């Protein structure tokens, strides 16, 4: 893996159920009998959602977690594990819905302003989740319901590993910058979702709060603004993503916009974690979209991640550290292209978040963002959950490996391992001052041959005069790997002689002893 390291000793694979709710796609005795066979390959718990607009329907406080339970309780009937997604936004409109599931319709009517909902820059209004901005009401709908969810799953809080927070649209932290009614879909720029008029009175407010006056506005900006309300969100969104975002006023503007999202985290991250903490004692995760493409076109640079509400991953992420919620980024199976007119640059993406987390320390997850149907996929997946830390990888969905035998048995070998420890000792290494030992494999687990980023360092013992080091390896899994040196430069001065080989790896912990 990077910086010498191998996989992520708590590698678990999750898998996500269906968008509906079991009876309208299956009976609950096959179910039971699909969980046995995932966890056969692999699998370690089902992702679910649980819709606030199934929980929450007839009206306020009005509960209903007869599903959830039911849920609950064929995943314990089944000796699986589960994580519930507390989905506060519309099922449906995005990419792979197949469901029809909005909010509570009542909702809408606790405020007369426009607070509660989005509309872009050309005025199409969004409704899928509720205005992070309106952080009141939030604060109650979420509050209680979090708590009343907490209470009724209390019995089943042994089958519950983690527990998702749904932060914007299809569950993730986001601005709803790209839907069709918008003309915003995949591949076009997004648009700015702030033009509701509190929105632009928010903004407003934050400036003035920033500056004091009108007057320093003017003079930080360097315009010559008449009044207050010329304070305004971009009037067009396609100069400012072309040379206003370089402005002082384009970098104002892009805090305050991704500010709200930061601060929305830290919300709903103290909210659940005082309603679950106690109870289920189970980390608890937010999303983060792949807004991949226009990331490298000349004309509006990251066109799509900007006005979805990306403009500086590492300050996002610091609010997640702050709100103690574990990430997941929501497309990990895709590579570069960065070629007109998609300007597509997934992997370079996953790549640079996956840094920043694990430089902070935060636990990374990740996720394929559409359906695998090729097994060439499922070693993209494996190349960067195994070489980049991640903590866990959940795979959408349910029936694309359970109706599919051979794709199931693809994932198993692949991406259903077990992380072990295992001793690696190498014996009559001809190294020299400056020299150091790494090994590298076949599997993505040991680098997949490469001797550049993810080779694994092992360590010279003085006593015995020989190189080792624990590894963390996949149990019963069959692997070929081989040491080689790497001169203090960094250049590979030899390898060793022959290729060595674990036909598998052992379950238990022991030894691999070979000579050079
Ligand atoms: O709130 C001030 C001003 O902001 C916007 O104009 C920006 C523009 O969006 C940027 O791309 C760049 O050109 O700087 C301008 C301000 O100097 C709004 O379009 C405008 O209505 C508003 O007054
Ligand atoms: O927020 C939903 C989903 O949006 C993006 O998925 C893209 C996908 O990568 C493209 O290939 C194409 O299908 O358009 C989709 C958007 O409608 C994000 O990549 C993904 O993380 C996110 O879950
Ligand atoms: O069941 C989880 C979640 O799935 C869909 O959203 C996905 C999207 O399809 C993929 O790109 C995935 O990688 O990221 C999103 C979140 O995981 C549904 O649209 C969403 O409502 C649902 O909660
Ligand atoms: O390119 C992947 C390749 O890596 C290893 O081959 C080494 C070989 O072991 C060395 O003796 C020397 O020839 O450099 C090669 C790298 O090009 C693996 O042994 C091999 O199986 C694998 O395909
Ligand atoms: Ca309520």
């Not at 952080?135 to 209680?144: A, L, N, P, Q």
């Not at 879909?185 to 700015?192: E, I, M, N």
């Amino acid at each position: 893996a990077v910086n010498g390291k191998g996989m992520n000793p708590d590698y678990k694979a999750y898998l996500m159920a269906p968008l509906k709710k079991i009876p309208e796609v299956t009976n609950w005795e096959t179910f039971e009998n699909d969980l046995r066979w995932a966890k056969q390959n692999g699998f370690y718990a089902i992702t679910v959602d649980f819709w606030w607009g199934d929980m929450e329907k007839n009206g306020d406080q009005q509960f209903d977690f007869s599903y959830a339970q039911r849920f609950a309780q064929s995943v314990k009937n089944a000796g699986m594990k589960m994580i519930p997604i507390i989905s506060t936004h519309q099922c449906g409109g995005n990419v792979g819905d197949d469901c029809n599931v909005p909010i509570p319709s009542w909702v809408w009517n606790q405020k007369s302003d426009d607070s509660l909902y989005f509309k872009s820059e050309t005025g199409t209004v969004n409704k899928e989740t509720l205005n992070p901005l309106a952080s009141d009401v939030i604060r109650k709908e979420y509050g209680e319901l979090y708590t009343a969810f907490a209470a009724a799953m209390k019995p089943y809080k042994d089958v519950i590993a983690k527990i998702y927070l749904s932060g914007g649209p299809a569950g993730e932290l986001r601005y709803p910058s790209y839907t069709t009614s918008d003309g915003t879909g995949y591949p076009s720029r997004g648009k700015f979702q702030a033009y509701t008029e509190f929105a632009k009175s928010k903004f407003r407010l934050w400036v003035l709060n920033k500056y004091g006056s009108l007057n320093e506005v003017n003079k930080a900006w360097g315009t010559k603004l008449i009044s207050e309300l010329a304070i305004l969100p971009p009037s067009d969104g396609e100069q400012f993503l072309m040379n206003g975002y370089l402005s002082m006023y384009g970098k104002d503007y892009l805090e305050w916009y991704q500010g709200i999202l930061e601060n929305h985290t830290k919300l709903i991250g103290e909210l659940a974690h005082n309603a679950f903490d106690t109870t289920f004692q189970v980390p608890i995760g937010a999303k983060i979209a792949g807004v991949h493409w226009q990331y490298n076109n000349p004309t509006i640079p990251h066109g799509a991640e900007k006005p979805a509400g990306y403009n500086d991953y590492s300050h996002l992420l610091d609010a997640f550290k702050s709100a103690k919620l574990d990430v997941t980024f929501t497309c990990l199976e895709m590579t570069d292209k960065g070629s007109y007119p998609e300007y597509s640059m997934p992997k370079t993406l996953v790549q640079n978040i996956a840094t920043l987390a694990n430089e902070k320390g935060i636990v990374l997850n990740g996720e394929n963002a559409l359906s695998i149907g090729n097994e060439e996929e499922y070693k993209r997946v494996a190349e960067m959950a195994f070489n980049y830390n991640f903590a866990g990888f959940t795979l959408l969905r349910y029936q694309d490996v359970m109706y599919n035998n051979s794709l199931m048995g693809k994932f198993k070998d692949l991406l259903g391992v077990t992380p072990v420890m295992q001793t690696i000792v190498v014996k009559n290494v001809p190294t020299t001052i400056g020299d150091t030992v790494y090994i590298t494999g076949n599997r993505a687990e040991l680098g997949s041959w490469d001797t550049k980023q993810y080779p694994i360092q092992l360590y010279y013992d003085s006593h015995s005069n020989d190189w080792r080091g624990n590894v963390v390896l996949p149990a019963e899994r069959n692997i070929e790997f081989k040491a080689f040196i790497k001169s203090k430069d960094g250049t590979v001065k030899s390898w060793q002689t022959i290729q060595q080989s674990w036909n598998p790896v052992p379950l238990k912990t022991t030894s691999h002893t070979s000579s050079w």
